Amino acid sequence: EIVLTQSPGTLSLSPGERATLSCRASQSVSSSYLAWYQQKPGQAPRLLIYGASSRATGIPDRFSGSGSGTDFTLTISRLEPEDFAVYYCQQYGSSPTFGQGTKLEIKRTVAAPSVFIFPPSDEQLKSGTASVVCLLNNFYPREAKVQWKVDNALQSGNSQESVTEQDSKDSTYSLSSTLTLSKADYEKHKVYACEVTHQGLSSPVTKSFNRGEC
Amino acid sequence: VQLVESGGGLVQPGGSLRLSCAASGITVSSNYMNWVRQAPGKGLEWVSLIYSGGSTYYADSVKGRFTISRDNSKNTLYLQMNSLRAEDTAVYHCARDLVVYGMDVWGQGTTVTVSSASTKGPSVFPLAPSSGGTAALGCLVKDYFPEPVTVSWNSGALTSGVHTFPAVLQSSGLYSLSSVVTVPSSSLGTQTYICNVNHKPSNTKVDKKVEP
Amino acid sequence: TNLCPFGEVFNATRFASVYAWNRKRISNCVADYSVLYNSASFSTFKCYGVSPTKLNDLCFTNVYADSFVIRGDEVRQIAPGQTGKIADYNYKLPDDFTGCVIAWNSNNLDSKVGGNYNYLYRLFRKSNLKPFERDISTEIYQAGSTPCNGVEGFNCYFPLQSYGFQPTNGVGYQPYRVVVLSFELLHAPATVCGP
Amino acid sequence: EVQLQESGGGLVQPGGSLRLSCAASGSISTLNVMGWYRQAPGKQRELVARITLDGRPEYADSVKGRFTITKDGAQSTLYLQMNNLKPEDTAVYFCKLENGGFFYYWGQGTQVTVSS
Ligand SMILES: *[C@@H]1O[C@H](CO)[C@@H](O[C@@H]2O[C@H](CO)[C@@H](O)[C@H](O)[C@H]2NC(C)=O)[C@H](O)[C@H]1NC(C)=O
């Protein structure tokens, strides 16, 4: 079948700059079926382009489409603030199919995270579970590595992460990483440490605490 | 001109639901019509197509389980969904398809949540702050079902520096999130900080004071 | 006494658009079907209710020879029990079809460098065609409840679309000429025969 | 599969005679029909004479009583004996082979000119 791959996964640019988004098909395909869509957070998709190069009625003049064969392109000539969003391409065999989407985000300068670690509360320990929380606050770009070390052993497979949307004021991200343990496991160990790697840091930053020491 | 989906909600694995899409300004029975869904933080996935003339097509992930149909007298499109699975959890949109002219009209969607969990109010635990710089503190809002949860700080007085994170679904089937704020560390001496947590599906309202 | 005129169909300079598909009625004549099937040349040659290598031993009351151009993707739809834009809205075979479907890649006659926009298909139609129905209506398709009054616009679409046949198209998007032979045997007399 | 070689044309005076030959080679079904056609300048192609499957010759009206068409099966060649030629017989003449009822083949085209 037709498989659409979009590039890049994330595009980082500034208002007034030129965005170029690529959609590659797994196979030569008719340009007559290639459509582009915009999606803003919480909103339904909006058709921008149909037939690879025709604008939908109402779509501003700066949106432009092109390409042929397997390689198609969406071009936003001069980015307005409302153009920052997700974009999908779409093709058609016997049925519609969608590319995985390109995120268009606001470029800003590098900003290292502030890193904080939170031990589990006594209330939680009472109920038999321990959650340890590591916070990376207001950083850019989005890429960051969070490693949990317990008694200096790298911990895999018992953490989950959540990330905010780009901050409306300073354009950064923040990230929450939660390590989950039983009360009994948590009390088997002494040193709980969160190690953060980020382009804005000259070397990795570790925040830690010792269980039971103020 | 509108498409309005409804009928989505909670359902248990193996169960079944019927979605409805009420059109205004297009005639359902005269169009190519699609259901397109979108899982949390995922892309768009086409699911089902019905031709004007009645032919139907299905994504492989739903063949044998979903059935697209319509009711001409009610100008309404349906998606019958049987043998529902956790990975079917998504916002489900209907859209009119012009094929060579793309999908021009989309509905806002209806949410389907496939889960065997029981409705449960959250536990709210403090994230305690630990000196001329910046401190962080917050509340961990743990083990609730279903979504949503709302968090405010100091009854809405404190908004600057607040980050309320998207929930994660845990392996237990219950959701969990954190809400944090950064303040001047000297403010811990002269300020009190309380998160206000609302989980209306369980009628839970909790205020939790956070201190060192 | 007469030689069958299938050559008008297979050697025609230009073929019909599928929505306006041609039909030639063959009667009172003889033909040698081995000339047809021993020429290689065909990307598709599938028969239903008859065997090709048997055809020279048969007589039929009439034979219909339908012909048109569709995209290589779509030749699969020229078969009993199919669905799709072609089978539903342009050319439909009945479930009890007795005949042969014959197709061959025509990229080098029917495609042109900047696109051959002369071959059309029907994209919009309210209901499916009956078997062997031919709809050549060019009325504006009304997709809502407001009349179109012969004006294209929102909810008002020209019902036919052009193939864009360019020689660089992928093989599935390249034009294929199709000939559908139907073997009609009512009663007497069977006057279309092999040698 | 089928090649057709034409000969016998050129310029003659009114009243003169020509013989056209169409030599048919290749893979030819026992069921075939050969004929001679012509295309006057700025007009449409018209049948002149042909041998039906019965072996029976058939003539256009304007040439009946003047032209004789025969088929020498041994050389699989088709002969158009043209007597009593007239200026209105001027045209490019083509022979046609209808093979098995499914395909046909044309010759390159032979100029005949009747003028004084
Ligand atoms: C009528 O169609 C036949 C069948 O496709 C044509 O015959 C082919 O012609 C090409 C080029 O001359 C040959 O390479 C093939 O081998 C021929 N096939 C057969 C079975 O004869 C024929 O030339 C066409 N007649 C026209 C266009 O006048």
Please state, in angstroms and rounded to a whole number, the distance separating the CA atoms of residues A85 and A41. Answer: 7
Give the containing element (helix H, strand E) for D4: strand D2-7
Please state, in angstroms and rounded to a whole number, the distance separating the CA atoms of residues C92 and B23. Answer: 31
Cis peptide before B40 (omega within 30 of 0): no
Q: Which CATH architecture has domain A4-106?
A: Sandwich (2.60)
Q: Whats the size of chain D, residue-wise?
A: 116
Q: Which two tokens stand for residue B35?
A: 């259901």
**Cα(C39) to centroid(ligand 1), Å:** 9
Please state, in angstroms and rounded to a whole number, the distance separating the CA atoms of residues B152 and C70. Answer: 62
Q: How many CA atoms lie within 13 A of A125 on its CB side?
A: 11
Q: Which CATH architecture has domain B123-209?
A: Sandwich (2.60)
Per-position DSSP letters for chain B, written without gaps between them: -EEEEE---EE-TT--EEEEEEEESS-GGGSEEEEEEE-TT---EEEEEE-TTS-EEE-TTTTTTEEEEEEGGGTEEEEEE-S--GGG-EEEEEEEE-GGG---EE---EEEEE--PPPBPPEEEEE-----SEEEEEEEEEEEBSS--EEEEGGGTB-TTEEEPPPEE-TTS-EEEEEEEEEEGGGGGT--EEEEEEEGGGTEEEEEEE--
Q: Do C170 and A29 touch (CB under 8 A)?
A: yes
Please state, in angstroms and rounded to a whole number, the distance separating the CA atoms of residues B188 and B169. Answer: 32
8 Å CB contact between D50 and D35: yes
8 Å CB contact between B210 and B201: no
Please state, in angstroms and rounded to a whole number, the distance separating the CA atoms of residues B197 and B139. Answer: 9
∠ Cα C85 C165 C179 (to 5°): 60
Q: Three-state SS for A34?
A: coil
Please state, in angstroms and rounded to a whole number, the distance separating the CA atoms of residues C153 and C143. Answer: 10
Please state, in angstroms and rounded to a whole number, the distance separating the CA atoms of residues B59 and B50. Answer: 12
Helix, strand, coil abundance in chain D, percent, nearest 5:
5, 55, 40
Please state, in angstroms and rounded to a whole number, the distance separating the CA atoms of residues B32 and B98. Answer: 7
* Closest-CA distance of chain C to residue B29, Å: 8
CA distances from D47 to B81, B151, C30, D33 (A): 68, 92, 21, 13
Please state, in angstroms and rounded to a whole number, the distance separating the CA atoms of residues B44 and A73. Answer: 19
- DSSP, res A33: G
Could you give phi then psi for residue B201, rounded to 5 degrees? -60, -25
| Burial (Cβ within 10 Å: 0-12, 13-18, ≥19) of residue A42 | exposed
Per-position DSSP letters for A88-145, written without gaps between them: EEEEESSSEEE---EEEEE----BPPEEEEEPPPHHHHHTTEEEEEEEEEEEBSS--E
Q: Do D103 and C3 touch (CB under 8 A)?
A: no
Provide the greatest CA pair distance for chain C: 60
Q: How many CA atoms lie within 13 A of D103 on its CB side?
A: 16
Could you give phi then psi for residue A107, rounded to 5 degrees? -70, 140
Q: Where are the domains of chain A?
A: 4-106, 114-210
Within its chain, how far is the Cα of A210 from the centroid? 32
Q: Which two tokens stand for residue A19?
A: 């965005």
10 Å Cβ neighbour count for C10?
19
For tokens 């498409």, name the residue: B3
Could you give phi then psi for residue C188, rounded to 5 degrees? -85, 155
Nearest to C102 by CA among C21, C26, C1, C10: C10
Please state, in angstroms and rounded to a whole number, the distance separating the CA atoms of residues D112 and C45. Answer: 43
CATH of domain A114-210: 2.60.40.10
Those residues with Cβ within 8 angstroms of residue C158's Cβ, 6 or more apart along the chain or in another chain: C138, C140, C141, C152
Chain D environment of C34 (Cβ under 8 Å): 29, 100
| Burial (Cβ within 10 Å: 0-12, 13-18, ≥19) of residue B88 | buried
Q: Which two tokens stand for residue C181?
A: 């032979």
Those residues with Cβ within 8 angstroms of residue A89's Cβ, 6 or more apart along the chain or in another chain: A4, A6, A23, A34, A35, A36, A37, A72, A74, A98, A99
The C-alpha R_g of chain C, in whole angstroms, comes to 18
Ligand 1 and D1: CB distance under 6 A:
yes
Q: Three-state SS for D36?
A: strand
Ligand 1 and D17: CB distance under 6 A:
no
8 Å CB contact between C9 and C65: yes
Within its chain, how far is the Cα of A138 from the centroid? 14
Q: Do A114 and B36 touch (CB under 8 A)?
A: no
Nearest CA to ligand 1 atom 13: D1
Per-position DSSP letters for A47-104, written without gaps between them: EEEETTTEEPTT--TTEEEEEETTEEEEEESS--GGG-SEEEEEEESSSEEE---EEE
Can chain B be said to touch chain C, i.e. do they have 3 or more Cβ pairs within 8 angstroms? yes
Could you give phi then psi for residue B94, rounded to 5 degrees? -100, 150
Q: Which chains have 3+ CB pairs within 8 A of B?
A: A, C
Please state, in angstroms and rounded to a whole number, the distance separating the CA atoms of residues A10 and C84. Answer: 37
The residues that bridge with A192 in the sheet, in sequence order, are A150, A209
Ligand 1 and D105: CB distance under 6 A:
yes
Q: How many CA atoms lie within 13 A of B105 on its CB side?
A: 22
Nearest to D22 by CA among D11, D37, D43: D37
Chain D environment of C52 (Cβ under 8 Å): none
Residue A2 amino acid letter: I
The residues that bridge with A209 in the sheet, in sequence order, are A192
For tokens 């007497």, name the residue: C188
8 Å CB contact between A121 and B166: no
Nearest CA to ligand 1 atom 17: D1
8 Å CB contact between B173 and B165: no
Nearest to B12 by CA among B93, B73, B98, B88: B88
Q: Three-state SS for A184?
A: helix
Give the containing element (helix H, strand E) for D46: strand D46-51
Q: Whats the size of chain B, residue-wise?
A: 212
CB of A53 within 8 Å of a chain B CB? The answer is no
8 Å CB contact between B168 and A162: yes
Q: Whats the size of chain A, residue-wise?
A: 214
Can chain A be said to touch chain B, i.e. do they have 3 or more Cβ pairs within 8 angstroms? yes
SS3 letters across chain C: CCECCCHHHHCCCCCCEHHHCEEEEECCEECCHHHHHCCCCCCEEEEECCCHHHHHHCEECEEEEEEEEEEHHHHHHCCCCCCCHHHHHCCCCCCCCCEEEEEEECHHHHCCCCCECCCEEECCCCCCCCCCCCCCCCCCEECCCCCCCCCCECCEECCEEECCECCCCCHHHCEEEEEEEEEECCCCCCCEECC
Please state, in angstroms and rounded to a whole number, the distance separating the CA atoms of residues C135 and C21. Answer: 9
First-residue to last-residue Cα distance in chain B: 56
CB of C187 within 8 Å of a chain A CB? The answer is no
- Kindly give the pairing relationship between strand B162-164 and strand B175-184: antiparallel
Q: Which fold has domain B2-114?
A: Immunoglobulin-like (2.60.40)
Tally of helices (H runs) and strands (E runs) in chain D: 0, 11
| Burial (Cβ within 10 Å: 0-12, 13-18, ≥19) of residue C151 | exposed
10 Å Cβ neighbour count for D75?
12
Please state, in angstroms and rounded to a whole number, the distance separating the CA atoms of residues A192 and A180. Answer: 12
Q: Which two tokens stand for residue D50?
A: 């042909």
Per-position DSSP letters for A154-167, written without gaps between them: EE-SSEEEEEPPPP
- DSSP, res A15: T
Residue B176 amino acid letter: S
8 Å CB contact between A140 and A171: yes
Q: How many CA atoms lie within 13 A of C54 on its CB side?
A: 11
Q: Which of A28, A32, A94 sits opposite C170 (nearest CB)?
A: A28
Chain B environment of A88 (Cβ under 8 Å): 43-44
Nearest to D68 by CA among D33, D76, D59, D77: D59
∠ Cα B116 B117 B119 (to 5°): 135
**Ramachandran class of A183: left when φ > 0, alpha when ψ lies in -120 to 50, beta otherwise:** alpha
- Kindly give the pairing relationship between strand A54-55 and strand A71-76: unpaired
Pocket test for ligand 1, best of C32, C36, C39, C105 (most atoms within 8 A of CB): C39
Q: Three-state SS for A152?
A: coil
Please state, in angstroms and rounded to a whole number, the distance separating the CA atoms of residues C100 and C44. Answer: 10
Question: What technique determined this structure?
Answer: X-ray
CATH of domain D2-114: 2.60.40.10
Torsion of CA B8, B9, B15, B19, to 10 degrees: -10
8 Å CB contact between C48 and C98: yes
Torsion of CA B169, B170, B175, B181, to 10 degrees: -90
Residue D68 amino acid letter: T
For tokens 């079809």, name the residue: C97
Q: Three-state SS for A3?
A: coil
Cis peptide before C189 (omega within 30 of 0): yes
Within its chain, how far is the Cα of C169 from the centroid? 21
Nearest to D6 by CA among D21, D19, D17: D21
First-residue to last-residue Cα distance in chain D: 41
Please state, in angstroms and rounded to a whole number, the distance separating the CA atoms of residues C179 and C68. Answer: 7
Cis peptide before B146 (omega within 30 of 0): yes
Nearest to B51 by CA among C78, C101, C82: C82
Ligand 1 and C11: CB distance under 6 A:
yes
**Ramachandran class of A81: left when φ > 0, alpha when ψ lies in -120 to 50, beta otherwise:** alpha
Final resolution, Å: 2.3
CB of C129 within 8 Å of a chain D CB? The answer is no
Nearest to C85 by CA among A35, B105, A95, A30: A95
Chain C environment of A30 (Cβ under 8 Å): 164, 169, 173
8 Å CB contact between D62 and D88: yes
Sheet holding B204-210, edge to edge: B150-153, B193-199, B204-210
Please state, in angstroms and rounded to a whole number, the distance separating the CA atoms of residues B25 and B13. Answer: 36
8 Å CB contact between D97 and D105: yes
Q: Which two tokens stand for residue D89?
A: 């017989």
Q: Three-state SS for D62?
A: helix
Residue C97 amino acid letter: F
Q: Do D31 and C29 touch (CB under 8 A)?
A: no
